[PDB]
Coordinates of C-alpha atoms and ligand atoms in Angstrom, one line a residue:
Chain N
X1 CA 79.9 94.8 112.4
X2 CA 79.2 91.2 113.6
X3 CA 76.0 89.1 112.1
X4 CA 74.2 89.6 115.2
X5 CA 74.6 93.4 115.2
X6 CA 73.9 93.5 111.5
X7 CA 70.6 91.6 112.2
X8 CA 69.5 94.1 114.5
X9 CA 69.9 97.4 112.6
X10 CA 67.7 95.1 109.6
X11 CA 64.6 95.9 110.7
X12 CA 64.6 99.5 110.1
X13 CA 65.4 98.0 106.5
X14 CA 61.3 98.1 105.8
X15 CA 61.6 101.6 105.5
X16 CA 63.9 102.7 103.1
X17 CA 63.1 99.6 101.1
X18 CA 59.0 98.5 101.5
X19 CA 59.1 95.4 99.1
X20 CA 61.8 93.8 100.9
X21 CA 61.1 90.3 101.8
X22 CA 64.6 89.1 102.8
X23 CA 67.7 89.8 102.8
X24 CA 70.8 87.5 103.0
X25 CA 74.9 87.9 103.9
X26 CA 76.5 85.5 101.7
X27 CA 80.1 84.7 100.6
X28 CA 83.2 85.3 102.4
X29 CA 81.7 87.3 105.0
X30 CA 78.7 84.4 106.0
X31 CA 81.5 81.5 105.4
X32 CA 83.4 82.5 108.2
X33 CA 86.6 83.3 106.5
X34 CA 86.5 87.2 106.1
X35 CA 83.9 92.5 99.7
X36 CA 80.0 92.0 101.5
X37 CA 77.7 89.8 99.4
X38 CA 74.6 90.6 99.7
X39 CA 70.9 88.5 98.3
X40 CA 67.3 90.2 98.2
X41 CA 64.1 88.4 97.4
X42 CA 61.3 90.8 96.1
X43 CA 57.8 90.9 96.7
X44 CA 56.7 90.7 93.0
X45 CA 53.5 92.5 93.6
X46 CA 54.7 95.3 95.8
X47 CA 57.8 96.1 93.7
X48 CA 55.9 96.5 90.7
X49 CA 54.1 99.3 91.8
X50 CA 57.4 101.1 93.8
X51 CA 59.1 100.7 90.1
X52 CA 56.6 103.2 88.9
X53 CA 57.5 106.2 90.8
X54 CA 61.3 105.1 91.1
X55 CA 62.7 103.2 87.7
X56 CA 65.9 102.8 88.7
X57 CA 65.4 101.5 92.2
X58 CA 67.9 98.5 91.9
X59 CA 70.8 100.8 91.6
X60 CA 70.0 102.9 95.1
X61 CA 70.1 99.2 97.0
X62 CA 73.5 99.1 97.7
X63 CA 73.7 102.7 99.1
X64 CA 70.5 101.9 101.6
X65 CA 72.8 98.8 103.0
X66 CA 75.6 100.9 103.3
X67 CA 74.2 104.3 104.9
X68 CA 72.3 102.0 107.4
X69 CA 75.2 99.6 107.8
X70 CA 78.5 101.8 108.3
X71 CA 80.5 100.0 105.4
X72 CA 81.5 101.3 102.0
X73 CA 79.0 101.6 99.3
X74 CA 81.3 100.8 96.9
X75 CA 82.3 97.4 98.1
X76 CA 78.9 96.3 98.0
X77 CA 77.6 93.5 96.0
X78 CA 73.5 92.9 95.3
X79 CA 72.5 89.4 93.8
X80 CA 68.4 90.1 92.8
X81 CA 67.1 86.3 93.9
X82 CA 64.0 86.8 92.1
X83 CA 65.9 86.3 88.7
X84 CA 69.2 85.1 89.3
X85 CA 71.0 81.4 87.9
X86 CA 70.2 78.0 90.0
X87 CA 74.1 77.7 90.5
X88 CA 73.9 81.4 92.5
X89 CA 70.7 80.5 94.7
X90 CA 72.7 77.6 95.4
X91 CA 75.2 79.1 97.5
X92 CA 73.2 81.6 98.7
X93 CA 71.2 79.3 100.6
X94 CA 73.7 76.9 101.1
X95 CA 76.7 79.5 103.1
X96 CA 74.4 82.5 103.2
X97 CA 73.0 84.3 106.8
X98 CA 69.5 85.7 106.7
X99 CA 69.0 89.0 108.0
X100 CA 65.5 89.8 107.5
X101 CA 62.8 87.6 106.6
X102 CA 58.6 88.0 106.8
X103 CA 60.0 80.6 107.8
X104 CA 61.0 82.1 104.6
X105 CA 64.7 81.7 104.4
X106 CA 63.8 78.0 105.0
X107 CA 61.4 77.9 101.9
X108 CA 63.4 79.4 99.8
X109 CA 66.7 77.0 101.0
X110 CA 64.6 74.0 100.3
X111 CA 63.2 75.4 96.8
X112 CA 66.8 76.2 95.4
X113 CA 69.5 74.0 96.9
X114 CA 71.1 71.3 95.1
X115 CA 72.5 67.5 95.2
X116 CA 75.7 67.2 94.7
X117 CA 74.9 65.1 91.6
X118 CA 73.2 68.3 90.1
X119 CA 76.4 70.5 91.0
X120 CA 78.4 67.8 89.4
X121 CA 76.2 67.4 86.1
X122 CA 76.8 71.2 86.3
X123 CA 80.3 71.5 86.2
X124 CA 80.9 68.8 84.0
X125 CA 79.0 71.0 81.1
X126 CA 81.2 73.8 82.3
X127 CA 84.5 71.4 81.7
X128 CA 83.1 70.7 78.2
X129 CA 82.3 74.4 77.5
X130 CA 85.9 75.1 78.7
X131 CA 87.3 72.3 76.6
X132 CA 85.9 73.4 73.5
X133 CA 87.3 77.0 73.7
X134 CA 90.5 75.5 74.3
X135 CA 90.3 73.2 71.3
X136 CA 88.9 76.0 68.9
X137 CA 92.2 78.2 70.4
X138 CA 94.6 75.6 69.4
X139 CA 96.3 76.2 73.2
Chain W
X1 CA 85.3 130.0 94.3
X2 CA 83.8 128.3 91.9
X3 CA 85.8 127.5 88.0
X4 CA 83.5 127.4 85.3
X5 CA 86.5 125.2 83.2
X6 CA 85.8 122.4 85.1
X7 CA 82.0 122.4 85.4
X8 CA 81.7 123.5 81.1
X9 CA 84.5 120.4 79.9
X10 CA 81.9 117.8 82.0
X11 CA 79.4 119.3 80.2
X12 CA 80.7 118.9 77.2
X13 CA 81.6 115.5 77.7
X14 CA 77.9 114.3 79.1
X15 CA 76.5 116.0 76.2
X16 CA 78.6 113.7 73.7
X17 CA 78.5 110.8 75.4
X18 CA 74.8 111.7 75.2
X19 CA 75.0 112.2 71.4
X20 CA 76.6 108.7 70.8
X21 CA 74.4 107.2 73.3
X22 CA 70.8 108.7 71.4
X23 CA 72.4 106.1 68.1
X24 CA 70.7 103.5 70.4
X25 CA 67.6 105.6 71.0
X26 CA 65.2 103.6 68.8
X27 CA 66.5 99.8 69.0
X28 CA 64.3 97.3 70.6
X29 CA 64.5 95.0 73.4
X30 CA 64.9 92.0 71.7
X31 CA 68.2 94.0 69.3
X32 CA 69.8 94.9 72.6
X33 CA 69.1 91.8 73.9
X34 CA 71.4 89.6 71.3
X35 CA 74.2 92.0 70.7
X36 CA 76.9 91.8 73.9
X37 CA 78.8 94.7 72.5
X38 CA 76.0 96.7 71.9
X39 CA 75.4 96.1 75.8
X40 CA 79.2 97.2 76.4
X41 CA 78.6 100.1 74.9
X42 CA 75.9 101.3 76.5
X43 CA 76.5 100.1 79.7
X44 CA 80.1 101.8 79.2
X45 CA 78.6 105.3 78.1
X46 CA 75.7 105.3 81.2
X47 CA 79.1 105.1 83.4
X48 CA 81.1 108.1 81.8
X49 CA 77.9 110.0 82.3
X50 CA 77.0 109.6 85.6
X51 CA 80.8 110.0 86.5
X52 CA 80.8 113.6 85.1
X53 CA 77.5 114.5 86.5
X54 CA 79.2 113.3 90.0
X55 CA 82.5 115.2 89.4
X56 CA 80.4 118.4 88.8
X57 CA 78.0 117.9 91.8
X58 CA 81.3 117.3 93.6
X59 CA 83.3 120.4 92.9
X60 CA 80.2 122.7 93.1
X61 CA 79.2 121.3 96.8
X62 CA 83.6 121.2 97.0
X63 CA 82.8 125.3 97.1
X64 CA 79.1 126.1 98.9
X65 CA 79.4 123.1 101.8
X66 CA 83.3 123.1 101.9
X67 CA 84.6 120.3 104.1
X68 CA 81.3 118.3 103.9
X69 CA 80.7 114.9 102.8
X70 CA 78.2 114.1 100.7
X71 CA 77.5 110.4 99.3
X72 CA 76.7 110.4 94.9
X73 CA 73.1 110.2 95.7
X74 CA 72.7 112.9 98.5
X75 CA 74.8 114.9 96.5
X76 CA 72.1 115.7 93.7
X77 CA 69.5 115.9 96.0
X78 CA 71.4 118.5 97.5
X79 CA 71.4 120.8 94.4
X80 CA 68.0 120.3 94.5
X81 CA 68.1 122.3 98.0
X82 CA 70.5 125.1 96.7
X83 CA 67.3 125.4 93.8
X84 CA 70.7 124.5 91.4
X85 CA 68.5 121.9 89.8
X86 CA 65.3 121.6 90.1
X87 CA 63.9 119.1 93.2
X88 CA 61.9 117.3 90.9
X89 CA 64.8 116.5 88.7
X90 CA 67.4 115.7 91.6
X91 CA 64.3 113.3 93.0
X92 CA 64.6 111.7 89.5
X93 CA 68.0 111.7 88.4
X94 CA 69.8 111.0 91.9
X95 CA 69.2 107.2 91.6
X96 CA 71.3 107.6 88.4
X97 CA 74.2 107.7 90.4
X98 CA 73.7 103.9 91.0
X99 CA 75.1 103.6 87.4
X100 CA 78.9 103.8 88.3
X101 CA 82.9 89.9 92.0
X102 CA 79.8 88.8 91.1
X103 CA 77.6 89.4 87.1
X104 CA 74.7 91.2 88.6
X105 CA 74.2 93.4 85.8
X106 CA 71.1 92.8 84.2
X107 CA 70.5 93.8 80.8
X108 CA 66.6 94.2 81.0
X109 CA 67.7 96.9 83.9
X110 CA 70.4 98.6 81.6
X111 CA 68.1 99.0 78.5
X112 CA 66.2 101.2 80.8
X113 CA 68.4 103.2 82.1
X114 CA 69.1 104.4 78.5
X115 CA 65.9 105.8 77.6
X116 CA 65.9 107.1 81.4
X117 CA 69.1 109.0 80.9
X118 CA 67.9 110.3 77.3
X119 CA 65.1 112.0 79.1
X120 CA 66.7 113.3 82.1
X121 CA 70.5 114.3 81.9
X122 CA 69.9 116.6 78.8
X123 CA 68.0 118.5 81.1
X124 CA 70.4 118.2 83.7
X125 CA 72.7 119.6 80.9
X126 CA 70.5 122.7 80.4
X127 CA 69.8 123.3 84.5
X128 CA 73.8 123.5 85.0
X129 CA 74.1 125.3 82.4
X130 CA 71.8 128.2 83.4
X131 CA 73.2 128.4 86.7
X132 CA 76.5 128.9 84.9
X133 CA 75.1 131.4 83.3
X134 CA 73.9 132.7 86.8
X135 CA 77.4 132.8 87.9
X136 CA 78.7 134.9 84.6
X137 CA 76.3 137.7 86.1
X138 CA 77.1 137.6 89.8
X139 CA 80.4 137.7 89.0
X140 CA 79.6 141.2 87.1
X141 CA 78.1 143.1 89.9
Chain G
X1 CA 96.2 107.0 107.4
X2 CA 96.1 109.6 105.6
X3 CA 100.1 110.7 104.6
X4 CA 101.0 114.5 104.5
X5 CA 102.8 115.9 101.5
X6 CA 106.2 115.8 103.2
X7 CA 105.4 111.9 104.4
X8 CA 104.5 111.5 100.3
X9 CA 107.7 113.8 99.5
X10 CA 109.8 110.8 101.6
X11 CA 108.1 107.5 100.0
X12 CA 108.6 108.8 96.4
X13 CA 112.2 108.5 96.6
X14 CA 111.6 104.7 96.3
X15 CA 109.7 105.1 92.8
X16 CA 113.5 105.2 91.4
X17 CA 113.8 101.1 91.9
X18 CA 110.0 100.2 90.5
X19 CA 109.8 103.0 88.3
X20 CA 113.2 103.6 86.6
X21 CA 111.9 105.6 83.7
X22 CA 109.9 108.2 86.3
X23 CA 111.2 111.8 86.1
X24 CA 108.1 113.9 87.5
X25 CA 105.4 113.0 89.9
X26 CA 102.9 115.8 90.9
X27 CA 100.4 115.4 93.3
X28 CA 97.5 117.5 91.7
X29 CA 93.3 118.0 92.5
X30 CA 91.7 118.4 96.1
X31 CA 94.7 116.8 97.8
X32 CA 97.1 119.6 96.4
X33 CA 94.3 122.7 97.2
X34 CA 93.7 121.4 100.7
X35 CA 89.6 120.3 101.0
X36 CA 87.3 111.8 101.5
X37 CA 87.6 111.4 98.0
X38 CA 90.3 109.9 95.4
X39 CA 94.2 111.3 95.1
X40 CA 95.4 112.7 91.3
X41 CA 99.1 112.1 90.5
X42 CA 100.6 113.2 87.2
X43 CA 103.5 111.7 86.2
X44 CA 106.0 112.5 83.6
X45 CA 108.2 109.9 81.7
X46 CA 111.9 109.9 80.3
X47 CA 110.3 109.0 77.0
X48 CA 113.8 107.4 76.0
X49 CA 114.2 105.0 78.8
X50 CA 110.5 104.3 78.5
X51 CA 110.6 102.9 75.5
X52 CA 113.3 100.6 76.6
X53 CA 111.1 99.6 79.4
X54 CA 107.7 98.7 77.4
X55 CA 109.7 96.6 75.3
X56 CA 110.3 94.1 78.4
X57 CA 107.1 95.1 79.4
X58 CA 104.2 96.0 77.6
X59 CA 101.8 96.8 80.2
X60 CA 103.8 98.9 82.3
X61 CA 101.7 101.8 82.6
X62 CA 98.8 99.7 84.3
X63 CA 100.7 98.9 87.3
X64 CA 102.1 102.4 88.2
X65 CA 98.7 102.9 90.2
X66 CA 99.7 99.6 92.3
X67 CA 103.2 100.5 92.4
X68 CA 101.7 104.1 94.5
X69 CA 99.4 102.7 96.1
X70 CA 102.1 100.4 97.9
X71 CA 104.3 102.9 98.7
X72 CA 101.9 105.6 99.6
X73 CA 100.1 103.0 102.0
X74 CA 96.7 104.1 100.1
X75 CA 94.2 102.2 98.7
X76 CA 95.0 101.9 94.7
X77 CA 91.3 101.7 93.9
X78 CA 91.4 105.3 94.6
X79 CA 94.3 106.8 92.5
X80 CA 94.2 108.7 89.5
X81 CA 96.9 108.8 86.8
X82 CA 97.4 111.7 84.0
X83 CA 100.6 111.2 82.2
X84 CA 101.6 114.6 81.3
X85 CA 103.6 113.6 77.9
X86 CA 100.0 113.0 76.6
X87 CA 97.2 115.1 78.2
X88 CA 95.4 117.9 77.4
X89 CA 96.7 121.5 77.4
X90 CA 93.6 122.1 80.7
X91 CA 95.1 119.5 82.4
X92 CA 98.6 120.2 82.3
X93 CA 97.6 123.9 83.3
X94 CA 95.8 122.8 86.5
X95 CA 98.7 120.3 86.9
X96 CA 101.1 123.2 87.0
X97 CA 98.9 125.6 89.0
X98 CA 97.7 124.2 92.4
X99 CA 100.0 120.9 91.9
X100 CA 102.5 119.7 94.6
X101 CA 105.9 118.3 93.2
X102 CA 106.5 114.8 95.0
X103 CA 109.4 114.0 92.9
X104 CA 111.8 115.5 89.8
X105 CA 114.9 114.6 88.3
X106 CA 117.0 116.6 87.9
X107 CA 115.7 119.9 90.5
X108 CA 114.6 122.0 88.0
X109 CA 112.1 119.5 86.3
X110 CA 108.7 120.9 87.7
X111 CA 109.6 124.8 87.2
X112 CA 110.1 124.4 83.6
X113 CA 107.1 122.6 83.4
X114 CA 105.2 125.0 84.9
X115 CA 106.2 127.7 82.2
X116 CA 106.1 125.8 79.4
X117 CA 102.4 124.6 80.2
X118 CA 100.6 127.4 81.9
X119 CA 97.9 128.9 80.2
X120 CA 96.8 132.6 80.6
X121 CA 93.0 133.5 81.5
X122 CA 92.9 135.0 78.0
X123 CA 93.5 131.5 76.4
X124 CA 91.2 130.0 79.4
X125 CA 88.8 132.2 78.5
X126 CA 88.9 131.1 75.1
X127 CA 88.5 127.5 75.7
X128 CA 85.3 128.6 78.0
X129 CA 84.0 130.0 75.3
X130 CA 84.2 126.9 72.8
X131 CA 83.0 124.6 75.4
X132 CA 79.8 126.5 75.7
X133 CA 79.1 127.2 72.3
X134 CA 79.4 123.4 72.1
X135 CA 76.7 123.2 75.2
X136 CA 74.7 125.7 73.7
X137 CA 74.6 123.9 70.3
X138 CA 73.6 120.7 72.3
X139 CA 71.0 122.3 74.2
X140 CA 69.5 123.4 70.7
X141 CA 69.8 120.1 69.2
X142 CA 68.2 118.1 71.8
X143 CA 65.2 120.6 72.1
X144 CA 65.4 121.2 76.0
Chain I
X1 CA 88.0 72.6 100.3
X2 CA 87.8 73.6 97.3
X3 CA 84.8 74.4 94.6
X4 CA 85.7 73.6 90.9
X5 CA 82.4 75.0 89.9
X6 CA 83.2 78.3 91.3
X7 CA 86.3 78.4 89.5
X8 CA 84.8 76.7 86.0
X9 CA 82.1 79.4 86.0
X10 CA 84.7 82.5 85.7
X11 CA 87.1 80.5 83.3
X12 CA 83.7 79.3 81.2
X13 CA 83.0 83.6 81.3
X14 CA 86.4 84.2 80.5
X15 CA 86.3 82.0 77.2
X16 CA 83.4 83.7 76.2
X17 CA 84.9 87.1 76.5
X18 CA 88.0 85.9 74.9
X19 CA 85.8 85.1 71.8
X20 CA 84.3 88.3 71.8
X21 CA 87.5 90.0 71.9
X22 CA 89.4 88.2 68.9
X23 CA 86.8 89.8 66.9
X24 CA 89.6 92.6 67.5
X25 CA 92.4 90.4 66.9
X26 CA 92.9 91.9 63.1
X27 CA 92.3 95.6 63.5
X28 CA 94.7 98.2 62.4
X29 CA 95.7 101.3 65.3
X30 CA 94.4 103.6 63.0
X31 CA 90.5 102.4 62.4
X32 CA 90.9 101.5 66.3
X33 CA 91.5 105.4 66.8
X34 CA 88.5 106.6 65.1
X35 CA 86.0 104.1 66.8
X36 CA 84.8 105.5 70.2
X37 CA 82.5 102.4 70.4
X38 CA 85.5 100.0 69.4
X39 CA 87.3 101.4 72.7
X40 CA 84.6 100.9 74.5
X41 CA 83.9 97.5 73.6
X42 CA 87.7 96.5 73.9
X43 CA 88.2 98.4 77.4
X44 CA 85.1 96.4 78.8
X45 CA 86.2 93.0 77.5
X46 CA 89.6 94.0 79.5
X47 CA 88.2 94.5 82.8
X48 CA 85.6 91.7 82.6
X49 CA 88.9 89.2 81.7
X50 CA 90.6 90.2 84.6
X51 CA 88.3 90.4 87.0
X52 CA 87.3 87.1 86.4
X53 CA 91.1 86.2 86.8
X54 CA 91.1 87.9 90.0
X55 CA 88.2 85.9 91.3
X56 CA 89.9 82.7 90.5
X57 CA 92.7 83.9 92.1
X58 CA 91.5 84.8 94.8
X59 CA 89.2 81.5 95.1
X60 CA 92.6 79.4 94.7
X61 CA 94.3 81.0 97.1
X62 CA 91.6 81.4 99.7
X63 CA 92.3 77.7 100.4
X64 CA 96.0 77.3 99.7
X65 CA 97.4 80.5 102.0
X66 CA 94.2 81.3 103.8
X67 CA 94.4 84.1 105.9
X68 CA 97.4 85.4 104.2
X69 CA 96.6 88.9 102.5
X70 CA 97.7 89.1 98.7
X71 CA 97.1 91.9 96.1
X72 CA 95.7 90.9 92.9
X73 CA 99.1 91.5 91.0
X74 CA 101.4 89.2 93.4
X75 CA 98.2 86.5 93.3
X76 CA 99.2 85.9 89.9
X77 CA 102.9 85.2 91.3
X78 CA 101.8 83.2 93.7
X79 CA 99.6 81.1 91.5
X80 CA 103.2 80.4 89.9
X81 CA 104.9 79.4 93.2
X82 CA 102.6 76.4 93.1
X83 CA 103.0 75.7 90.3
X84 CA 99.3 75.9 88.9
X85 CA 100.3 78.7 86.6
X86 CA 104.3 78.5 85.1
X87 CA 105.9 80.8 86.4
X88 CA 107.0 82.2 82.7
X89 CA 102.9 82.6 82.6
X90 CA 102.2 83.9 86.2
X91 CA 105.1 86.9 85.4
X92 CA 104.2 87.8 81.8
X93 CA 100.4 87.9 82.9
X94 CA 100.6 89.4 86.4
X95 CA 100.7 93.2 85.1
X96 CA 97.2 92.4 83.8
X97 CA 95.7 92.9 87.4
X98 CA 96.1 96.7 86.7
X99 CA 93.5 96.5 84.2
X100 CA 90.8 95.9 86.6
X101 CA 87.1 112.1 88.1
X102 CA 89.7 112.0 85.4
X103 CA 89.4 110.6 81.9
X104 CA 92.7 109.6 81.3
X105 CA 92.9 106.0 79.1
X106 CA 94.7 106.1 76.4
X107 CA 93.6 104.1 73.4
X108 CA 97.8 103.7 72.3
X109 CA 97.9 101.7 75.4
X110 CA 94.8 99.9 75.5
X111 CA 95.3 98.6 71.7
X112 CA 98.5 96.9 72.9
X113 CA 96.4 95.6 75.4
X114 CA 94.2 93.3 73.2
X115 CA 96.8 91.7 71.5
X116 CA 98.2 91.0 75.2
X117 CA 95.1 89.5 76.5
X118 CA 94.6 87.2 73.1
X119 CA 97.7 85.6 73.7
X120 CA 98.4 85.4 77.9
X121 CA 94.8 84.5 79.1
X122 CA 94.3 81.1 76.7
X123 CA 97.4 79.6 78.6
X124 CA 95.7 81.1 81.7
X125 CA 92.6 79.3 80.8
X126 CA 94.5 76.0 79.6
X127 CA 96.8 76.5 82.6
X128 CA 93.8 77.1 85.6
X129 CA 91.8 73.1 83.3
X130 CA 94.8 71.8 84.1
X131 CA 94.9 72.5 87.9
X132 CA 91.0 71.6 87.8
X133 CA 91.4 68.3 86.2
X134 CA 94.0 67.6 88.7
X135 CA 91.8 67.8 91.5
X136 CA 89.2 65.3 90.1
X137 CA 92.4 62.6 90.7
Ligands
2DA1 P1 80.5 82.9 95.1 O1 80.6 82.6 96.5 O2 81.8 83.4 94.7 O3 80.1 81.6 94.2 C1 79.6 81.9 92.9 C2 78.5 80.9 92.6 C3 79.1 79.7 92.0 C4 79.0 80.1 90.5 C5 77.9 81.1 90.4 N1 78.2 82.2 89.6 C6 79.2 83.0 89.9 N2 79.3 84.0 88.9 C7 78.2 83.7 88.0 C8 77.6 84.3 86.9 N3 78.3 85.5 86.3 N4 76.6 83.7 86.3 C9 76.0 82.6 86.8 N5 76.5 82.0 87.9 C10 77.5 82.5 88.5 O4 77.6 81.6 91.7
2DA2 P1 90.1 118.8 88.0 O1 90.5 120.0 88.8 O2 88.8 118.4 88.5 O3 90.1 119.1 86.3 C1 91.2 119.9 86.0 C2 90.9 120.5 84.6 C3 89.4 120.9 84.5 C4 89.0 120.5 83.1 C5 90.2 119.7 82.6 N1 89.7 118.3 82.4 C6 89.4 117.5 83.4 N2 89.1 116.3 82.8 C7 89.3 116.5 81.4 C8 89.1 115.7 80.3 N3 88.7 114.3 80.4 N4 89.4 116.2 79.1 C9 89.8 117.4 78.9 N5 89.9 118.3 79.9 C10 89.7 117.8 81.2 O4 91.1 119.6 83.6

């Protein structure tokens, strides 16, 4: 299905899942270069009271993508932007496609991205974290 | 027709993995929390369970709806229709089926689906076994 | 595309050059009885050359699901390996009894496996038996 | 074209699982047999390794040969065709990408497994730092 087409079956989304907020294509399938990745933000307030009657409602989101969608369940990947890690939101805002929203893709773009001088602070704690295995190893 | 073998080794297996996975029934948040292999396990034994539960669902519909497709979660909802288990309990347990690139797997979500699938696959355990038993006497007459 | 036994019964000729050691391969489960799902293969080993083979190899038996897969043209996500030389007596029976034989060496590799697995409903009846006494005792224990 | 962090957040996981899993690096076949949990631990470790391996992989080669379809086991040839991975390494480590409705693991096989991973995925970690450190240059 092409991002257009995916957009447009989207707004039935608010029925099979009524906190939905938004909803965003990311990785290889957004970057151009063709597994879906897929990002929901949460309204707080109205998924606390759907968790009540429906505990394990996290683990039916990637079969309502898929039944609505046409693609295999099983190749489906849910990132939970609500609590996920800076370096995740990151690319998600940065590469990612939003496919439902209720100027809140924009909010949450400017709210998470980073400088390149964050990503690079980043990634050099990563190289030292790396480093260290690789000293304690003996390799 | 439908081979009782196959439906009674699942059960077996569920109720075992269930047995090992009750040795975690009483630890807290915060002891799940800073063990990672106490999170393998778990997260491990939530997977052979809800894989059996699918294989029976699976070769029971393979027999009443023959040639249909059903997806994991539609699948227990459907034994809810054929009053195999109850429709409360498929309602509750068919988002178990959720169970089976990226680190999305939150422990805070995991811990409860422990105590979740304490409460409901035993009894999913006891409805398939009584329509076993169901099938024993048809089978008679 | 979905192959048909005689299409598998032509691409498992080629398992002699990836896997030397191969003597049996049975296609087993739904795809053998006839009803989208995942395809079962059991395969059984020349234990002798096998051993030769792991030596130079020692994680041979995790590729034989990518060496199918490549052959079959199906996806190896969705294939299923039982190695016969150490399964349980169920499995082997089910194995022998709706099972297709996609390959044997020599001819008469899949026949004598078939009688020397088989189980009769007396001893299937047995095993039903055990299995629910061991539900039943569950059941009991867990109070439901 | 490339993203070092993507690839030093998988090796950074794979370390840790790696120090998780020498915890297994002195255990006899026999207590490993009589430890249901112990399997499961050591088959999880497994498939979070190599997936993680895969990913790289598959990152790496996403700008080298883009376009170009690989599986994950020639991926970990390839990575030895250019010479980011030896190609000693790249072969020895290759069959690992087949760790990634029938119970049929065998813990025989799985043991031999461990001591596998404890000794190929180091270099594959020391191996991928080097590739990384030559793109700062
Ligand atoms: P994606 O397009 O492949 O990029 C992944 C992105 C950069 C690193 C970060 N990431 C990946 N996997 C992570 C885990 N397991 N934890 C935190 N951050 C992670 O997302
Ligand atoms: P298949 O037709 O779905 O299974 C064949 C036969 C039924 C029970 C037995 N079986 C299947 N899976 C088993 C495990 N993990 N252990 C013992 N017996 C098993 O095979």
């Amino acid at each position: 299905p092409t991002i257009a087409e995916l957009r447009e079956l989207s707004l039935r989304l608010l029925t099979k899942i009524p906190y939905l907020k938004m909803l965003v294509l990311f990785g290889s399938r957004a970057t151009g270069n063709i597994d879906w990745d897929f990002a929901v933000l949460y309204d707080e307030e109205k998924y606390n009271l759907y968790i009540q009657n429906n505990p394990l409602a996290a683990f039916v989101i990637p079969g309502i993508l898929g039944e609505i969608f046409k693609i295999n369940s099983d190749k489906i990947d849910i990132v939970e932007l609500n609590h996920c890690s800076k370096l995740i939101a990151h690319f998600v805002a940065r590469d990612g496609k939003v496919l439902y929203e209720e100027d809140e893709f924009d909010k949450f773009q400017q709210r998470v991205l980073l400088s390149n001088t964050e990503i690079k602070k980043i990634e050099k704690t990563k190289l030292e974290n790396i480093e260290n295995f690789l000293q304690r190893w003996g390799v | 027709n439908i081979e009782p073998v196959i439906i009674e080794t699942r059960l077996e297996l569920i109720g075992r993995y269930l047995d090992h996975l009750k040795k975690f029934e009483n630890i807290s948040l915060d002891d799940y929390l800073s063990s990672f292999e106490q999170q393998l396990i778990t997260e491990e034994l939530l997977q052979l369970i809800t894989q059996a539960a699918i294989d029976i669902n699976d070769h029971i519909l393979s027999k009443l709806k023959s040639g249909k497709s059903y997806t994991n979660f539609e699948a227990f909802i459907e034994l809810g229709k054929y009053q195999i288990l109850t429709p409360e309990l498929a309602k509750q347990i068919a988002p178990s089926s959720g169970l089976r690139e990226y680190d999305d797997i939150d422990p805070n979500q995991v811990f409860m689906a422990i105590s979740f699938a304490l409460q409901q696959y035993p009894l999913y355990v006891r409805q398939i076994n009584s329509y076993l038993i169901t099938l024993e006497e048809e089978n008679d007459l």
